[PDB]
Ligand binder design. Structure first.
Ligand SMILES: [Ca+2]
Ligand SMILES: [Ca+2]
Ligand SMILES: [Ca+2]
Ligand SMILES: [Ca+2]
Length: 147
């Protein structure tokens, strides 16, 4: 949950981009500029929502810690997603988008968990929602959560 000093100053850097007048707070106006300057055209209403949902102190603008806390929450969500994707990739030994019984066995072994044939097949079936005999990425996420 603690950020490093370089993550904080990069985040300051990023904040700086949004903070057009450098007053240390980001307005609806400034937010709109940054987006327009990237193709997007949002309503005042939408800008107001984006600010308001970030504006923990309700003063009407986003300051550095408010920005930072958003970024840290996004980062924590990406991280978690990545972790799940990496784990799937480790299991999916032929990189085919499915974990097979054989792939689950081999990998499970190489992680110091040696399973029986029966246990391997049970673990596939538990997770195998659509009954095709192999575990796709969303089955793998589903069953990971179960816990
Ligand atoms: Ca500003
Ligand atoms: Ca604020
Ligand atoms: Ca595979
Ligand atoms: Ca399946």
């Amino acid at each position: 949950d603690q950020l490093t000093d370089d993550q904080i100053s990069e985040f300051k850097e990023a904040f700086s981009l949004f903070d057009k007048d450098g007053d240390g707070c980001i307005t609806t106006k400034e937010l709109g500029t940054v987006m327009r300057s990237l193709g997007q055209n949002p309503t005042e209403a939408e800008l107001q929502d984006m600010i308001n949902e970030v504006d923990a102190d309700g003063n009407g603008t986003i300051d550095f810690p408010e920005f930072l806390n958003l970024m840290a929450r996004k980062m924590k969500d990406t991280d978690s997603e990545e972790e799940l994707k990496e784990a799937f990739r480790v299991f999916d030994k032929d990189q085919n988008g499915f974990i097979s019984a054989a792939e689950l066995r081999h990998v499970m072994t190489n992680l110091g968990e040696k399973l029986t044939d029966e246990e391997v097949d049970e673990m596939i079936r538990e997770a195998d929602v659509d009954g095709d005999g192999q575990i796709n990425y969303e089955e793998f996420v589903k069953v990971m959560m179960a816990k």
